[PDB]
Design a protein around this ligand. Sequence first.
Ligand SMILES: [Mg+2]
Ligand SMILES: [Mg+2]
Ligand SMILES: [Mg+2]
Ligand SMILES: [Mg+2]
Ligand SMILES: [Mg+2]
Ligand SMILES: [Mg+2]
Ligand SMILES: [Mg+2]
Ligand SMILES: [Mg+2]
Ligand SMILES: [Mg+2]
Ligand SMILES: [Mg+2]
Ligand SMILES: [Mg+2]
Ligand SMILES: [Mg+2]
Ligand SMILES: [Mg+2]
Ligand SMILES: [Mg+2]
Ligand SMILES: [Mg+2]
Ligand SMILES: [Mg+2]
Ligand SMILES: [Mg+2]
Ligand SMILES: [Mg+2]
Ligand SMILES: [Mg+2]
Ligand SMILES: [Mg+2]
Ligand SMILES: [Mg+2]
Ligand SMILES: [Mg+2]
Ligand SMILES: [Mg+2]
Ligand SMILES: [Mg+2]
Ligand SMILES: [Mg+2]
Ligand SMILES: [Mg+2]
Ligand SMILES: [Mg+2]
Ligand SMILES: [Mg+2]
Ligand SMILES: [Mg+2]
Ligand SMILES: [Mg+2]
Ligand SMILES: [Mg+2]
Ligand SMILES: [Mg+2]
Ligand SMILES: [Mg+2]
Ligand SMILES: [Mg+2]
Ligand SMILES: [Mg+2]
Ligand SMILES: [Mg+2]
Ligand SMILES: [Mg+2]
Ligand SMILES: [Mg+2]
Ligand SMILES: [Mg+2]
Ligand SMILES: [Mg+2]
Ligand SMILES: [Mg+2]
Ligand SMILES: [Mg+2]
Ligand SMILES: [Mg+2]
Ligand SMILES: [Mg+2]
Ligand SMILES: [Mg+2]
Ligand SMILES: [Mg+2]
Ligand SMILES: [Mg+2]
Ligand SMILES: [Mg+2]
Ligand SMILES: [Mg+2]
Ligand SMILES: [Mg+2]
Ligand SMILES: [Mg+2]
Ligand SMILES: [Zn+2]
Lengths: 50, 135, 59, 24, 86, 134, 105, 122, 104
Amino acid sequence: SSHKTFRIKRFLAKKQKQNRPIPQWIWMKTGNKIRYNSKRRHWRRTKLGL
Amino acid sequence: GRKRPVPKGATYGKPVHHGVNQLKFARSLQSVAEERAGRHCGALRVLNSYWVGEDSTYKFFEVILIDPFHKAIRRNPDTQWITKPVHKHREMRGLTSAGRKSRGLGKGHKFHHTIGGSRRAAWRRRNTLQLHRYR
Amino acid sequence: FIVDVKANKHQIKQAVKKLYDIDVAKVNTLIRPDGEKKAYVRLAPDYDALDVANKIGII
Amino acid sequence: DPVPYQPPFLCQWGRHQPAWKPLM
Amino acid sequence: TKGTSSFGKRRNKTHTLCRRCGSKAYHLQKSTCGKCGYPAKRKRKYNWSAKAKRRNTTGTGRMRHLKIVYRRFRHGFREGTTPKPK
Amino acid sequence: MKFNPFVTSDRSKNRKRHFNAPSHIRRKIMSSPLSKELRQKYNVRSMPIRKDDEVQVVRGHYKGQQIGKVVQVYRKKYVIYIERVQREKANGTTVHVGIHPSKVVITRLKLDKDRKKILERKAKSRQVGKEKGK
Amino acid sequence: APSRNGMILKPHFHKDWQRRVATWFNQPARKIRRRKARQARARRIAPRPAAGPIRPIVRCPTVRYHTKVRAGRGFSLEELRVAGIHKKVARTIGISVDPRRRNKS
Amino acid sequence: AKIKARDLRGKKKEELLKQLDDLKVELSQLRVAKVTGGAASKLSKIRVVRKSIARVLTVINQTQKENLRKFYKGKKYKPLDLRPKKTRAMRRRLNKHEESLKTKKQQRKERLYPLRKYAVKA
Amino acid sequence: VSELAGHQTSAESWGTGRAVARIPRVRGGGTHRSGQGAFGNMCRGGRMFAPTKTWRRWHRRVNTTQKRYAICSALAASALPALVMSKGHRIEEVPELPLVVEDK
RNA sequence: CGCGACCUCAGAUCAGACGUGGCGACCCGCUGAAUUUAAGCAUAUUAGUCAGCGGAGGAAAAGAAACUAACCAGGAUUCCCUCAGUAACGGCGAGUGAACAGGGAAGAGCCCAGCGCCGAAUCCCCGCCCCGCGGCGGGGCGCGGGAAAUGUGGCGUACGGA
RNA sequence: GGCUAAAUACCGGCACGAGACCGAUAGUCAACAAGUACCGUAAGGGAAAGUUGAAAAGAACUUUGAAGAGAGAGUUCAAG
RNA sequence: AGCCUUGAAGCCUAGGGCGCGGGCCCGGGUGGAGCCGCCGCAGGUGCAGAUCUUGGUGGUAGUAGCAAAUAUUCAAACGAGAACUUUGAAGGCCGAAGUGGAGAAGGGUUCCAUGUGAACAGCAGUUGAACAUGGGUCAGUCGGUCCUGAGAGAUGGGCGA
RNA sequence: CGACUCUUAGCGGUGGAUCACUCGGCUCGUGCGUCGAUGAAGAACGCAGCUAGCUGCGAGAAUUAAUGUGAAUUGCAGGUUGAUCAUCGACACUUCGAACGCACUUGCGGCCCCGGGUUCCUCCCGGGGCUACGCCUGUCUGAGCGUCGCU
Ligand SMILES: [Mg+2]
Ligand SMILES: [Mg+2]
Ligand SMILES: [Mg+2]
Ligand SMILES: [Mg+2]
Ligand SMILES: [Mg+2]
Ligand SMILES: [Mg+2]
Ligand SMILES: [Mg+2]
Ligand SMILES: [Mg+2]
Ligand SMILES: [Mg+2]
Ligand SMILES: [Mg+2]
Ligand SMILES: [Mg+2]
Ligand SMILES: [Mg+2]
Ligand SMILES: [Mg+2]
Ligand SMILES: [Mg+2]
Ligand SMILES: [Mg+2]
Ligand SMILES: [Mg+2]
Ligand SMILES: [Mg+2]
Ligand SMILES: [Mg+2]
Ligand SMILES: [Mg+2]
Ligand SMILES: [Mg+2]
Ligand SMILES: [Mg+2]
Ligand SMILES: [Mg+2]
Ligand SMILES: [Mg+2]
Ligand SMILES: [Mg+2]
Ligand SMILES: [Mg+2]
Ligand SMILES: [Mg+2]
Ligand SMILES: [Mg+2]
Ligand SMILES: [Mg+2]
Ligand SMILES: [Mg+2]
Ligand SMILES: [Mg+2]
Ligand SMILES: [Mg+2]
Ligand SMILES: [Mg+2]
Ligand SMILES: [Mg+2]
Ligand SMILES: [Mg+2]
Ligand SMILES: [Mg+2]
Ligand SMILES: [Mg+2]
Ligand SMILES: [Mg+2]
Ligand SMILES: [Mg+2]
Ligand SMILES: [Mg+2]
Ligand SMILES: [Mg+2]
Ligand SMILES: [Mg+2]
Ligand SMILES: [Mg+2]
Ligand SMILES: [Mg+2]
Ligand SMILES: [Mg+2]
Ligand SMILES: [Mg+2]
Ligand SMILES: [Mg+2]
Ligand SMILES: [Mg+2]
Ligand SMILES: [Mg+2]
Ligand SMILES: [Mg+2]
Ligand SMILES: [Mg+2]
Ligand SMILES: [Mg+2]
Ligand SMILES: [Zn+2]
């Protein structure tokens, strides 16, 4: 909504910054098992809660 | 006495448990008095209590309560058993004398249902298979 | 500027006045969807914003 | 993707359905 | 019309995030959390929900005080002393 | 046999102490024999390897008499990179091939103050064990 | 249902007995633990007897057992009064006392 | 320089705060260099400045609190920060002295009838 | 096997109708394990048939005289070369088979 | 009417303390079913169990006889073997169901009130000194304050005691 | 009216040790970013998922193609 | 004093055979690190079915289908490539109770620019709400905040194991 | 001969069984047996040069000091008077939460002290400390046609 609270806005702010892919140097490490961010949320598919 | 806190009548079960009215509480009213006084005063510790008066609708009890943190109690070797954490809320666990009476514990042939620590320890010790190693 | 989210306009005005030695006409604040607070610190017009931006490094 | 939950049955046979009704 | 078309009318919300347990189960009109019962002083936990207990036990979070309690226990809760300097 | 009730003789527990060891236990695990000259001299069987030690590879493809300097001790991989123990990549650059330190003998120790301290301590406890055996 | 000829017999497993099953894999560990506590008590009291105080000769009750002789709880106060041992000093030099024992014989 | 804590401990309050302010201005300039786009050397210098700030504030807090508990040493009521924090249950115990108090009757029994040291023969 | 293994689901069977084979199935949700067959020995997951209990009878008592008989038989046949070699020992150079040495 | 005691009862962001909640395998107190079995079922049974509520601790509880017995007597409590699937309870049906003696593990006993004697001989707190001060403790000096005779301490408790 | 250790209990916790146990549809739901992803208004429900090689030595370069894809060359004991 | 990196297990086999059979043993291949006979012990020990459970895969089958709301056409550009992108021209539609211009709830970055064309957008795409980088939301006056409404809910009191 | 179909074999796909592994369970045993108003358990948000998750941490924020250790960390950069690790006793430890000024919008206060504002002149701004309920000992201030005494 265009009317928010600070709590809900800060909640959405965290989920918007968690939503990035993995950096491409992270899979050049020694013990990598991570190929991609498997917790990527898309706003049409998964509706984040609330 | 203790009436059964169920909506209107309606104990949904067998005619044994249809009783609601004439039922009685397993603890006495003096122990209810001690545990109300000791729940209201969480710091103080219940020593004991005594009957002072009764009406048709009420009984009145004085309850003896003690600081375990006052320097007249905490520095006295006779009375500093109460200062220890094993005597937190004697009134809730049935450890004052009015609470001891409801537990049915004593020595001898009248008190076989609590031989062991209590009635629950008796029922537990009797209802175990000890399955030994070599049988 | 990008500012801590617990700040008032009064605190941003005192901090810009103290760190860079410059007086301020007004401060407008918004909080980003990133989460940071952004402050638009208007200067009193005897100061150039381009001069103080060249002072602090941003160009 | 969201694994589709098992098919949502909403009855039609039985006494309401007037299509395939037996004797009786 | 009890199925698809009645689902369109779902806009106003019943629960929001509780501020003691974080989960989206604070009912806004009853003003109580349905997950932990927030304005009650005690945690809502039941023993018929054995799995729901273990989702929120002491092993579940950081234990940002209790792990250093374990570490200070293993040396007897010493205070004020420092080891011998170089 | 071992008799200590608090040492583990379990396979998976010992493997888990090995591959999840901290760096100061990596240093002790990544140790290597001294050569027979240095072992005759310092009366010390083996030492943990360091960055500026000279080294002969004893087992493997790159083995030989060629004394090579250690380039850099890589305790995360349990491996060391030696001066000319290296191979050519596809594009043409040279890549250091890593040797495990146990397949390596030390021929010159890099002796700081702590290194001399460790050597004299190991020689001391060796002589004390030899005296109790005497 | 009972087939031809057997004992009419009553298993007492009509409750939920499997929640309350005492297994005894503790047992050689309890024997080790008791033995070490016993030796710690013995090493503590250094010349003093490892069993404890003397306990009296005592008849068993019940016509089944009155031929037999046990060790008692403690020495009677009449026995201490006749032998000339003070009942508070008897505990100090390793004599058992109990003030409940009568003497009839 | 390599701001070590040992040669911060002898110094005075004023020079610690001036060095703190020097490092705070230094960290501000490195964050400007991070946002404008600077060298890699400044970007690795930012961690040196953050840990040196943590060191200086640490030494300031050391010399503050140990002076305060030098101040409240003999006093019967001292601040809750300076009182001994072990576990809560271990703070509500009896003292070392209150555990050692006997009654007069019990001390008279321990005086009169000590547990003797005895053995018995074969 | 632990007592709780296979029984930590809540799973009602779907009953008749629905053209499935009347096993308890996992209740709802958008996951793989939902409606998927939960209790019972033949399901993926699930308990196995008659979980092994720790009150199996592990230990056997033998009579003392039987144990001593077996010690006596095991000693009496360790003095015969045919039986010691049939156990497998390389003994062809041993001087005498009840082989006794000094107490040094 | 005013002053003063006392008694009951208030108000304090009064000086200092203490309780709150968590975990909950073990333990203590209540509350407490119905599936089930009885080839039905209602008493019984499951079962003083599940769920519910409160409270601890490193164990808890119990505990030094208003006991057992009927012997030539044993002697706190708790735990194990046994008693013993027994005595007994039970639509006497299905089912349920102890204790005592005996052998062990362990073993430890004590304190009040009252009754009375002792000049309240007792306790708390604040000020100053000496010691120690990360379990605020000991000694002393205080015509400093309070508690307490509506009873603090010492002797003393059924084994008798003065 | 009151106190009291020891023997006794302990599927929670901290730290250990062992096993005629299981061996990735098994064993904990969970050998892995698992009470995670995801579902449900909520209480609650709740996964799939291990393995290159001794060492990345993870295929430079030439070549068709818009590229994905290939053909040669090369690494390696082996890219079967 | 079993077998094995001079090649274990598994797996394949128009190969040679043995046993009534359960089964087994040899050869060839693949594979790369373990395994087996005999005397005993022990069990979570042998599948074709359970509308069995889990995973995978067929025929159906290049099939049903991509048919509600009238409609597209011509040239040019970029591009490897155009029925669908973009510009222009034409012909049409919604027709102010709109297919228009703005908001509440809800959503949460979808907004905007640049790039990519793997996957997704049930044909296709040079396009996208996709994907990857970067940006963007500025108040004394607009709202909240304040008030109270139907209601909710402490304290005193009452009840309550 | 063709196509199509069927069967068998060889090779190749699909698919991931089997086998061999195993930083994981499960069971049994042992020792210890330790949370919180000195703010717990749990939750929220932040913190790395490049960092989403996990992990660790708390504005001193992938940690500080101290001690032990003795030359690394490492994906890529950049820089022995102690690197890095472990230990962890000193210090620090944001916001909710028993959760504490009142509410739960991060909204609205009250008191005292500091500094700009002032030249104690009231506001304004910033910092700091207080401001929960219950209950115990004592303290002060009181209430009473409660029981009395004196004038
Ligand atoms: Mg939608
Ligand atoms: Mg009935
Ligand atoms: Mg009852
Ligand atoms: Mg009675
Ligand atoms: Mg509503
Ligand atoms: Mg609770
Ligand atoms: Mg040893
Ligand atoms: Mg038959
Ligand atoms: Mg004994
Ligand atoms: Mg006395
Ligand atoms: Mg299973
Ligand atoms: Mg106060
Ligand atoms: Mg509690
Ligand atoms: Mg029936
Ligand atoms: Mg039946
Ligand atoms: Mg019953
Ligand atoms: Mg229960
Ligand atoms: Mg505890
Ligand atoms: Mg006790
Ligand atoms: Mg008595
Ligand atoms: Mg008895
Ligand atoms: Mg019998
Ligand atoms: Mg009958
Ligand atoms: Mg019964
Ligand atoms: Mg007996
Ligand atoms: Mg008296
Ligand atoms: Mg008594
Ligand atoms: Mg007691
Ligand atoms: Mg063993
Ligand atoms: Mg798997
Ligand atoms: Mg497999
Ligand atoms: Mg699994
Ligand atoms: Mg699989
Ligand atoms: Mg594979
Ligand atoms: Mg191969
Ligand atoms: Mg074939
Ligand atoms: Mg291999
Ligand atoms: Mg098996
Ligand atoms: Mg099959
Ligand atoms: Mg067609
Ligand atoms: Mg519009
Ligand atoms: Mg519109
Ligand atoms: Mg498409
Ligand atoms: Mg757009
Ligand atoms: Mg304006
Ligand atoms: Mg209410
Ligand atoms: Mg595989
Ligand atoms: Mg971050
Ligand atoms: Mg350091
Ligand atoms: Mg260091
Ligand atoms: Mg509001
Ligand atoms: Zn909640």
